């Protein structure tokens, strides 16, 4: 694929801008925090953008009107971490892994998470997971700072 080194936080801002009207519309309380303004990562920018768009879209759909979304990005030395949290329904415990299967659907293509897992784990050698937190759900991914 096509790896470059870029400021991950500029990418997150780009994705926020794409969804700003929708977030505003829905009176969603959106927060983005980082612990390093220039959060440099070597990655396929287009592919990481796709992951972010998917996670943000899912967060907006799940949280609903007057909902809450928080994105955090963190520089951890040999890796960077992005967490996307929304208030909303929890992932059932029995579905914690299954929601990442390409065969997971809802009523109908799935939540995009199988391709997010492919991008994060297969394409970038990272990790992606979910936890139920604070009356909602976080999706977390980590990618190594360099392949």
Automatic annotation (TrEMBL):
Binding positions for ADP? 58, 86, 105-107, 109-110, 113
The lineage's top-level taxon is: Bacteria
- Name all Histidine kinase domain ranges: 2-147
Q: Can you tell me which residues bind Mg(2+)?
A: 58
Q: What is this protein called?
A: histidine kinase
Species the sequence originates in? Thermotoga maritima (strain ATCC 43589 / DSM 3109 / JCM 10099 / NBRC 100826 / MSB8)
From-to range in the entire protein, with total length:
605 to 752 of 755
